[PDB]
Design a protein around this ligand. Structure first.
Ligand SMILES: [Cl-]
Ligand SMILES: [Cl-]
Ligand SMILES: [Mg+2]
Ligand SMILES: [Mg+2]
Ligand SMILES: [Mg+2]
Ligand SMILES: [Mg+2]
Ligand SMILES: [Mg+2]
Ligand SMILES: [Mg+2]
Ligand SMILES: [Mg+2]
Lengths: 195, 233, 125, 225, 211, 222, 204, 195, 195, 195
């Protein structure tokens, strides 16, 4: 269960921490929120191998971009992801959400499903557990939320996704992207289950 | 060889006396899930052509880029790029049709069904279809997917043959298109209420209408329907 | 349980008489009069509606019955026996004929089928 | 292409007349409108032998039922008997029907799927041309239709199928079932597909075909004397 | 059905004319004999296109041979060019049956059976195609080395007729050839619709039929 | 799985006269049970007094025709504007088709024109290039309906002269252009009745020494 | 594999003026191999004619079956069966084997002895009736027969003309089919006389 | 392929049947008689799947012999062939069909005519002047199309049959170990011991 | 999309009106809320044929039950459904929700998924579109709601299910079951889409 | 099955190879020589898939003849057999392998000894006193196990070979149309014209 939400001061990424092999939980403290640039991060879903290999390549492309042309846009990062996912669609199983913060463009979110298409959105949800919260998220999302409101929205949303999806679970990791910097958050079962 | 993931449904179109109309809903489906609700599937090329695309959206976005790049390339070393040597609907179509047939011949198709609607330099109406197989055909009315089964019958009641085109006005043609889009919303399980419509007239040019909705729907008769046969209550 | 009467209840007596058939004919003799007349361009069948009580609605009891659109029937004797015969006669006209040939049976063949049913009740267990 | 349309004081059904084996037209004037009882008619799509046989069987049993009960048959009875029969055979009897009629309860209109599902409606369509027909019905249907408006709508819906669907063609059959009246079966209500005159006659000269033997065939019975 | 046999007066080559696509009779007038050069013949069986294309290609290669070597190609070398070619395409799906019949001074009259499986056989008698068995039946039982050019021509013609009758995928007409020291000689197209009845009457055969 | 082939239906017909030739084809284009177009031309003027049609899978038919037209163009460039004879065109088309022997053009191809002696000529191809000159040939969906009719009414097959009783055949008298067009129209009218993929319109291309002429006729639209 | 095209064969029927005609080829084979050239596919029960194409064992079996049923019909009804009634008997009999069908394509032909009206009908292998006014076709060359009949046929033909039309329809259709031919028979039927003619055709 | 042939001449029917019994890679026997006498003037040869052939032949034989005793009368070849056909036609829609092809050669004492019937495992009956089952017909039918007459003698029929067997021995791939020949005429059934 | 919800005064059933064949909507005004007894109704999902045949049989069983033993319980109705669904599980595709009102037991809801198991619940959701509202329904459901609150809950829930599920759509039908009687409700697209 | 046999006696090697060429249902030829002379004192017989057999044999023949010219020297049978084995061992892992089995009979002029090598299509080489390929060995190996000696003469070897062929003609199902016999000794290679 992964999601990215834009708000007044920027954007927040959120994810669970479960990795499975059938019904066995191979890793219960996985970090699905990964960094491709200082203030451009992604949420990973699907194959762990595919999404890692892709994110590693993108990080390489944006590092080389930065050396030559300066800080890349979030749109530029989404395009590099897309190019990899689209051209290698036959051999990949990767559902990625790209989220970043500019000073000019502020918080932006791009989702990249299986085919390799790109969709810019106010917020995005993905992963097997996202199916159970389409209704909740659509009813409860608002534009220009506060940081505290947005954290609560992600926390409640992923809480339900974890509750119903067997492939989702563990802790709720979150990454906050603003002009202030990069803040990492974590929320444990005892906190979010009782919501 | 692949399978389509995020898909777009019907694209419908028809000729009228002074031009062509084309329409398509704003939905990007992910199987039975109506996932993306703000997708533009009509892509204008210049002020004389509109390409309506159905099928795989990732391949649609690829084609969208090819056309954008086509415009850029045609402008190179071309002082008459906004005049005599501007891109025509016939040029844009044949380009796409070439690509589609080449890709199917490599067994790696662009999983789409395309309709190029526009008006030529001499004012002639252009309307032609091409799909993932490279198959091409033209007709006074053209539609993809479910539109082929439900819209064409309705649009062919207005323009049944070539001689009916000069007799058909833009108000009558737009009325028919909008009605057809309602019918598809009644009966296509992968359609949306929201859609976009484009008119390319040889006099008034390109009119691109966004954020249209299906209206004047009939549902009231549902209240009287009870059970599946014998149920009185 | 089980129907353990698998033997004939109608048998030949020393004189060669089939008693139960004779006695059945005696029951028919007691029954109300009914008749039939054949004309050149038609046939008529008739009988008396012997009402068991004046409170009874004699319209609900039909002694003359349609078997097919072109065949009718009337009786004398036991009414209940007639009623079930009409049910069977109507059904056999469909199963053994109409569902095969796509048309209603001729009079003589429907009669033959009814006759068969009545013969079997004279020999079966 | 078969349709059913309800109106003010009754119901109307209609059908095309094309019968096909793959891409070939076997019959150009097939009769798809069947009679279950005098005032209950059905239109069938799918496997032709199945729609006919299932229609005759339930029609036979409905007649016997009507005689047993001394009542005019009801549409819900035919509906129930059909769906239970079709359900039992798990879709292997490929009969897709539109059943309509009038009875002491009123006017009725139903559809039946081969697996045994039934649907109720004011307007229905089945067959390969159902989409072409339904597009017309959804565009022009309204509440409180007259008899004349409903026949027009029904035949227009069939025409949509005839012209736009390759599995449908030729003529338009109709049956109108109004309350308090005899049902009127309108065979070849429309005939918009008459073959044009041929350019030439292919009548041969007598003797053109080569023959080896001739003989009289005895069709008569064995003779007297 | 196509046959080719060697005898005293050279070689007889006889073929039918039918072409099918399933049960559909596509043509009754096809040429299954290719005149490669004045002394070389090629027969065709199997894939129509495969046979046509590669046997006309064969003629181009045989012509190039006599340009470079200033001499007519032998039947052995001509047959082997074709067999080596189809062997390259083995597994790809070619379907061909071919008899390369001809005469040269050093070889004499020669027949080679060439197959899309890569088989290349030299022999005195060959019958190939869906009707080979029917032709073999007549040809084998009446064959002698010392037939007259007239009797041999008839036997080959009669053997095709036999096969055209019984085999559903054979028929149309019979094309005859005779190959000698001085080259090949066409001996006409013979429609089966007329030849059958003629043979039946004159020969007194085909009593299975009502005539 | 992706299927690179399709079936666009349609039917075509070529008849050769004594000093002319016709190539006819219906204008309907279909997929499955739907109509794509009621008027989509299928027979083309390819230059040098040659007409051509490639019936079956339209995408392959369009590609082939497009390539042959291109072949004619380059034949002029490379051989001093020499006219491409019908027999030379046929052989060129064999090589175009067989060049894709292992991924075929899924079409039945027919060309018509005049031979070098001025007589009418029709050539028929299978999908992989086998060709044959013929006096008469139908191709496509309703070819099985039409060809037997042409064997009977063009080559007078199974027809004899009355009085002789099967001894003497019907003589093979040549047919005029007016007599041929009647057979073409009747062929397509009959095929339209019994084949669902045939209809809408009929377009005939007639070839003479004077050039290429067109005739159009309506067909039933059901 | 496909039972309907192992043995091969064709049948065609036509109406004329106060007459009907029914014709068949004579071939019986095992795929490519021709076995018999005397295998007639037309039978008659009184004045009703029945042609059957398809799997030869079922053709033979059905003839024997309808001979059986028509003989009993006659004994009970005290009259010969009519074409309209026989047509329904065929349909009934075939549909009772709905899920294990006879692989055949029957064709009924005859004249109603009472009304004098000419009658033809065709069926699919499981019973569906095709009651046509003009003509009925069946067999491996049914497509070919449809094309010939639809172009050659015209209504109200006289017996001696109808013979030529149906004979030419059959002959030219059979010559474009590998599994049909090897002889042919044509029945010309009038209210009280029936002529049977064997046609001379190419034997390949 | 179990070669069985039949030829009907002027006054007799001649049946020829191969002697080989091959099971897999070995020829287990080279003197097998693939025929049963159904009645004094009726002989049936057979070929098909192992076991079924003999089981079917003997079953038919028993039934005809039963009929002969009951009625004190020999059935006509036509009657016997029709009985056999019905059994095979019944068999083809059974749980496990008889996989047997047969030739029935008989002399009708009433009509004073020889008769040959060819019946396959589907129940497909045809009366013929000469017949064969399996691949034998592919060679012999066309050969007999050329050399047969209706007025041939028994000796001419045997010479004609030798011509068939010679062709089969030349062109067929299996060694069928020659044939046993039997003649059926007015005097009954006899075996040609030298062939 | 189907659901049944218990509340203070009784129970409410709710459903969409879409019936599909692939992506074609065969019926857009379907009635999926069907009556098996005066105050025992069911919601149908899965095969239309299977669910109709089952509901017809159950109605027959409860009519016969009533004639002999008086009004049946909602638990009894659920048991008859179960018995049919469980014993014929190999040949059925039926997901049914049973809901009824007693005076003694008040409003009760039983859900019967594919296997044939029975689960008594405060509220239940089922059908392909239920997946998208597991999160919303879990967060927004309360026990002892008012009639008006419960109608709003079903309306909002099915609104979202229809929004996301292609197999769901049309009108929202509802059936209210209380001591007062049986009330049928309907809500059209223009009303519920704007929520 | 293309019968090829080989026997090594005191002073020679004898190869026997069937004459039949059967393609499908017809024996196209009955006088085919399934062998090639590689060098004056080395003979190779072969059997396998159509086309491949001759193509392979002639290819090997050409290579050995090339070696002979280059060095003006005849390779030993052992050397030739090793070359052949390597070509087949190379072939088995190719795109399309040679489907050919061979026997190599040679007389080593240096050691004055006859030598017989059996090599299958996989490249499996064995030196043997007697050998066979395909189904022939199933009959002949055990027969030769009983009748063979190392000190046998060429005439005794031929009588022993006649015994093999007689057994094959008795028990094998195909008519292989007899064999062509060739002897390889100190004087070279010669064919036994009467066998
Ligand atoms: Cl990971
Ligand atoms: Cl339902
Ligand atoms: Mg996932
Ligand atoms: Mg033949
Ligand atoms: Mg048509
Ligand atoms: Mg034929
Ligand atoms: Mg047989
Ligand atoms: Mg929806
Ligand atoms: Mg080895």
């Amino acid at each position: 269960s992964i999601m990215a939400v834009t708000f007044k001061d920027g954007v927040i990424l959120g994810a669970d921490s479960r990795t499975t092999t059938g019904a066995y939980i191979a890793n219960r403290v996985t970090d699905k929120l990964t960094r491709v640039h200082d203030k451009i991060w992604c949420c990973r879903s699907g194959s762990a191998a595919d999404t890692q290999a892709i994110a590693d390549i993108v990080q390489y492309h944006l590092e080389l971009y930065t050396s030559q042309y300066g800080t890349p846009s979030t749109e530029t990062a989404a395009s590099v992801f897309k190019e990899l996912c689209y051209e290698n669609k036959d051999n990949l199983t990767a559902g990625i959400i790209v989220a970043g913060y500019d000073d000019k463009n502020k918080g932006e979110v791009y989702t990249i499903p299986l085919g390799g298409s790109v969709h810019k959105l106010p917020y995005a949800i993905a992963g097997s557990g996202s199916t159970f919260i389409y209704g909740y998220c659509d009813k409860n999302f608002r534009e220009n939320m506060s940081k505290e409101e947005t954290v609560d929205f992600i926390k409640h949303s992923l809480s339900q996704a974890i509750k119903w999806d067997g492939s989702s679970g563990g802790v709720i990791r979150m990454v906050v992207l603003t002009a202030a910097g990069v803040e990492r958050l974590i929320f444990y079962p005892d906190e979010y289950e009782q919501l | 060889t692949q399978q389509p993931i995020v898909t777009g449904t019907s694209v419908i179109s028809m000729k009228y006396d002074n031009g062509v109309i084309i329409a398509a809903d704003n939905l990007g489906s992910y199987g039975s899930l109506l996932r993306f609700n703000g997708v533009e599937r009509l892509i204008p090329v210049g002020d004389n052509t509109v390409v309506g695309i159905s099928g795989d959206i990732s391949d649609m976005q690829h084609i969208e880029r090819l056309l954008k790049d086509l415009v850029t390339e045609n402008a190179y070393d071309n002082p008459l790029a906004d005049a005599e040597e501007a891109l025509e609907p016939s040029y844009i179509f044949e380009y796409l049709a070439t690509v589609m047939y080449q890709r199917r011949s490599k067994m790696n198709p662009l999983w789409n069904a395309i309709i190029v609607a526009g008006v030529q330099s001499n004012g002639d109406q252009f309307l032609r279809y091409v799909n993932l197989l490279g198959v091409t055909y033209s007709s006074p009315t053209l539609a993809t997917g479910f539109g082929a089964h439900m819209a064409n019958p309705l649009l062919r009641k207005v323009v049944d043959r070539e001689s009916d085109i000069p007799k058909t006005t833009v108000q009558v043609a737009e009325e028919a298109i909008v009605n057809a889009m309602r019918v598809l919303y009644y009966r296509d399980a992968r359609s949306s209420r929201n859609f976009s419509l484009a008119i390319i007239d040889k006099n008034t040019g390109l009119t691109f209408k966004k954020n249209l909705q299906v209206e004047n729907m009939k549902w009231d008769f549902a209240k009287d329907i009870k059970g599946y046969g014998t149920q009185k209550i | 349980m089980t129907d353990r009467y698998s033997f004939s209840l109608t048998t030949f007596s020393p004189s060669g008489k089939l008693g139960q058939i004779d006695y059945a004919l005696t029951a028919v003799k007691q029954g109300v009069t009914s008749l039939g007349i054949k004309a050149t361009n038609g046939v008529v069948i008739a009988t008396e509606k012997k009402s068991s009580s004046p409170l009874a609605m004699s319209e609900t009891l039909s002694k003359v019955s349609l078997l097919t659109p072109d065949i009718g029937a009337v009786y004398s004797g036991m009414g209940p026996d007639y009623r079930v015969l009409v049910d069977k006669s109507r059904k056999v006209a469909h199963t053994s004929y109409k569902r095969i040939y796509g048309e209603y049976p001729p009079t003589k063949l429907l009669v033959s089928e009814v006759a068969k049913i009545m013969q079997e009740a004279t020999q079966s267990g | 292409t078969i349709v059913g349309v309800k109106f003010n004081n009754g119901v109307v059904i209609a059908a095309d007349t094309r019968s096909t084996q793959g891409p070939i037209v076997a019959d150009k004037n097939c009769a798809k409108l069947h009679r279950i009882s005098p005032k209950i008619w059905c239109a069938g799509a799918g496997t032709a032998a199945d729609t006919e046989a299932v229609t005759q069987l339930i029609g036979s049993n409905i007649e016997l039922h009507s005689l047993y009960t001394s009542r005019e048959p009801r549409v819900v009875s035919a509906l129930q008997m059909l769906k239970q029969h079709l359900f039992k055979y798990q879709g292997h009897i490929g009969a897709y029907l539109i059943v309509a009629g009038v009875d002491p309860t009123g006017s009725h209109l139903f559809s039946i799927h081969a697996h045994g599902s039934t649907d109720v409606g004011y307007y229905l369509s089945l067959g390969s041309g159902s989409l072409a027909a339904m597009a017309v019905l959804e565009s022009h249907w309204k509440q409180d239709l007259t008899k004349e408006e409903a026949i027009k709508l029904a035949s227009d819906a069939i025409q949509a199928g005839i012209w736009n669907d390759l599995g449908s063609g030729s003529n338009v059959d109709v049956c109108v079932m109004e309350i308090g009246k005899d049902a009127e079966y309108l065979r070849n209500y429309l005939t918009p597909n008459v073959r044009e005159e041929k350019q030439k006659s292919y009548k041969f000269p007598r003797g053109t075909t080569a023959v080896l033997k001739e003989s009289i065939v005895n069709i008569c019975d064995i003779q007297e004397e | 059905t196509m046959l080719a046999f060697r005898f005293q007066g050279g070689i007889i080559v006889a073929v039918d004319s039918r072409a099918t696509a399933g049960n559909w009779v596509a043509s009754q007038t096809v040429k299954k004999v290719i005149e490669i050069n004045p002394f070389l013949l090629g027969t065709m069986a199997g894939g129509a296109a495969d046979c046509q294309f590669w046997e006309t290609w064969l003629g181009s290669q045989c012509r190039l041979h006599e340009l470079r070597e200033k001499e007519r190609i032998s039947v052995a070398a001509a047959s082997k060019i074709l067999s080596n070619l189809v062997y390259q395409y083995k597994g790809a799906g070619l379907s061909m049956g071919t008899m390369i019949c001809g005469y040269t001074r050093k070889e004499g009259p020669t027949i080679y059976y060439v197959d899309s499986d890569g088989t290349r056989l030299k022999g005195d008698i060959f019958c190939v195609g869906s009707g080979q068995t029917f032709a073999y039946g007549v040809l084998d039982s009446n064959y002698k080395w010392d037939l007259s050019v007239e009797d041999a021509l008839y036997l080959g013609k009669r053997s095709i007729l036999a096969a055209a009758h019984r085999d559903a995928y054979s028929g149309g007409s019979v094309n005859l050839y005779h190959v000698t020291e001085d080259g090949w000689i066409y001996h006409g197209n013979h429609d089966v619709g007329e030849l059958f009845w003629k043979v039946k009457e004159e020969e007194g055969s085909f009593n299975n039929v009502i005539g | 799985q992706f299927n690179p082939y399709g079936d666009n239906g349609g039917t075509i017909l070529g008849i050769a006269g004594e000093d002319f030739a016709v190539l006819a084809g219906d204008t309907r284009n279909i997929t499955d049970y739907s109509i794509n177009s009621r008027y989509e031309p299928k027979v083309f003027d390819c230059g040098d007094n040659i007409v051509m049609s490639a019936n079956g899978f339209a995408a392959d038919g369009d590609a082939l025709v497009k390539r042959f037209k291109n072949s004619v163009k380059w034949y002029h460039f490379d051989h001093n504007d020499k006219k491409l004879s019908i027999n030379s065109a046929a052989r060129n088309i064999q090589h175009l088709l067989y060049g894709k022997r292992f991924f075929p053009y899924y079409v039945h191809t027919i060309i018509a024109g005049l031979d070098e002696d001025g007589k009418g000529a029709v050539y028929s191809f299978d999908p992989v290039g086998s060709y044959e000159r013929e006096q008469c040939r139908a191709g496509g969906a309703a070819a099985s309906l039409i060809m037997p009719f042409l064997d009977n009414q063009v080559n007078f097959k199974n027809q004899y002269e009355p009085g002789t009783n099967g001894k003497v055949k019907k003589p093979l008298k040549y047919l005029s252009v007016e007599e041929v067009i009647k057979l073409v129209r009747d062929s397509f009218t009959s095929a339209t009745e019994r084949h669902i993929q045939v209809g809408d319109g009929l377009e005939i291309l007639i070839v003479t020494k004077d050039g290429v002429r067109k005739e159009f006729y309506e067909l039933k639209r059901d | 594999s496909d039972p309907s095209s192992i043995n091969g064969g064709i049948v065609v029927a036509m109406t004329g003026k106060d007459c009907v005609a029914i014709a068949c080829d004579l071939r019986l084979g095992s795929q490519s191999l021709g076995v018999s050239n005397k295998f007639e596919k037309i039978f008659h029960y009184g004045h009703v004619f029945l042609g059957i194409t398809g799997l030869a064992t079922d053709v033979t079996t059905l003839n024997e079956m309808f001979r059986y049923k028509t003989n009993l019909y006659k004994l009970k009804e005290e009259r010969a069966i009519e074409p309209e009634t026989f047509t329904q008997l065929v349909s009934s009999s075939l549909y009772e084997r709905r899920f294990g069908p006879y692989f055949v394509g029957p064709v009924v032909a005859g004249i109603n002895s009472k009304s004098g009206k000419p009658f033809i009908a065709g069926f699919d292998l499981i019973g569906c009736i095709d009651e046509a006014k003009d003509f009925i076709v069946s067999g491996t060359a049914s497509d070919q027969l449809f094309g010939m009949c639809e172009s050659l046929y015209e209504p109200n033909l006289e017996p001696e003309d109808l013979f030529e039309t149906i004979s030419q329809a059959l002959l030219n259709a059979a010559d474009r089919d590998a599994l049909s031919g090897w002889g042919a028979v044509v029945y010309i039927i009038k209210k009280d006389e029936v002529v049977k003619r064997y046609l001379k055709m190419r034997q390949d | 392929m179990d070669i069985i042939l039949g030829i009907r001449v002027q006054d007799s029917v001649i049946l020829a049947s191969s002697k080989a019994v091959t099971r897999g890679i070995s020829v287990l026997k080279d003197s097998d008689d693939k025929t049963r006498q159904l009645s004094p003037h009726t002989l049936m040869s057979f070929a098909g799947e192992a076991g079924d052939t003999v089981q079917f032949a003997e079953y038919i034989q028993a039934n005809i012999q039963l009929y002969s005793i009951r009625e004190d009368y020999e059935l006509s070849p036509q009657a016997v062939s029709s009985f056999v056909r019905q059994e095979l036609a019944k068999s083809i829609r059974s749980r496990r069909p008889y996989q047997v092809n047969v030739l029935i050669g008989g002399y009708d004492k009433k009509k004073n005519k020889p008769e040959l019937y060819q019946i396959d495992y589907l129940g497909t009956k045809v009366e013929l002047p000469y017949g064969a089952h399996g691949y034998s017909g592919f060679y012999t039918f066309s050969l007999l199309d050329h050399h047969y007459r209706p007025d041939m003698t028994t000796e001419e029929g045997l010479d004609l049959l030798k011509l068939c067997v010679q062709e089969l021995e030349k062109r067929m791939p299996m060694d069928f170990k020659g044939v046993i020949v039997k003649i059926v005429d007015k005097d009954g059934i006899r075996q040609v011991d030298d062939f």
